[PDB]
Write a protein that binds this ligand. Structure first.
Ligand SMILES: COc1cnc(-c2cnc3ccccc3c2)nc1-c1cc2c([nH]1)CCNC2=O
Length: 302
């Protein structure tokens, strides 16, 4: 007939965008509003569905600062599709653009926002569990949120507060390893149930990754994912914070604070933000959103 894919009543499905995916993320256009959007697709034939409740997690999250807006979730051919706000490049894309190292001022502007970003998620009774540069996106050139660091892909999320009992989820071990090894907390490596602290420790590893240019467990390979996971975990446990965070005292303080958090414990986000804003102010930095990537030329799918 038409040969054109539509999602819902007004969303035209466009070209495949981004790297990886394999057709899972497409540019889209709201024909009614003449606006571009991002469309996440998941084959209805999927063995491990995530789209629909990722959608639910977004519902649960609600309209929020740094949270992409979701417009639609519906069937599209042999695909379930979720239409949401089109954003810009990820911190990983920007990192490469900046030769794989961010200035402390850029990392602190990022860190201050993400601690708040994570606290927001946590305030909605959700733990993220998928921290990595690729899941943090700036907005787009003009849609006035380009300097806001956004958080995306809540497929690995989990409700850490039982909705009925209103109790924190129970501690337990033997959780299989799946997330990304490079940033995951040490306890995640130990097979322990993840909680608030783990999102915060993962952010710490990522902050040091940005500052150093790389992490010391980064090149570890093995004959089985499990083994690789185990080696990376061994090295994380074998690298002293003072060594990992050499030259960044605040980062070491942030890291061992979160590493020592109790499983059920509510992090003191104010305390962590202050470690960084005090530093920020002492260095003489001005929070003006002028990241290292400002002035460089960014990739735009449109
Ligand atoms: C609000 O969601 C999103 C909004 N914009 C974009 C975007 C924007 N400009 C771009 C410019 C160049 C290249 C790629 C781009 C991707 N990507 C996403 C998004 C969500 C998800 C993913 N990408 C990947 C896996 N899982 C997700 O949940």
């Amino acid at each position: 007939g038409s040969g054109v894919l539509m999602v819902g009543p007004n969303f035209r499905v466009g070209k495949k965008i981004g790297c990886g995916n394999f057709g899972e993320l497409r540019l889209g256009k709201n024909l009614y509003t003449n606006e571009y959007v991002a469309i996440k697709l998941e084959p209805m034939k999927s063995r491990a569905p995530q789209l629909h409740l990722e959608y639910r997690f977004y519902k649960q999250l609600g309209s929020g600062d740094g949270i992409p807006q979701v417009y639609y979730f519906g069937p599209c051919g042999k695909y379930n599709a979720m239409v949401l706000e089109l954003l810009g490049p990820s911190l990983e894309d920007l990192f490469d653009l900046c030769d794989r190292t961010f200035s402390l001022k850029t990392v602190l502007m990022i860190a201050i926002q993400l601690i708040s970003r994570m606290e927001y998620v946590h305030s909605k009774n959700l733990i993220y569990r998928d921290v990595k540069p690729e899941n943090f996106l700036i907005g787009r050139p003009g849609n006035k949120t380009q300097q806001v660091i956004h958080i995306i892909d809540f497929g690995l999320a989990k409700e850490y507060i039982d909705p009925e009992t209103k109790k924190h989820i129970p501690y337990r071990e033997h959780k299989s390893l799946t997330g990304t090894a490079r940033y995951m907390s040490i306890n995640t490596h130990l097979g322990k149930e993840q909680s608030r602290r783990d999102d915060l420790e993962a952010l710490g590893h990522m902050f040091m990754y940005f500052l150093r240019g790389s992490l010391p467990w980064q090149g570890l390979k093995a004959d089985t994912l499990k083994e690789r996971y185990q080696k990376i975990g061994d090295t994380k446990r074998a690298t002293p914070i003072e060594v990992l965070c050499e030259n960044f005292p605040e980062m070491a303080t942030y890291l061992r604070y979160v590493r020592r958090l109790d499983f059920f414990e509510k992090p003191d986000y104010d305390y962590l933000r202050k470690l960084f804003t005090d530093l920020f102010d002492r260095k003489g930095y001005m929070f003006d959103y002028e990241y290292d990537w400002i002035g460089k030329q960014l990739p735009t799918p449109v």
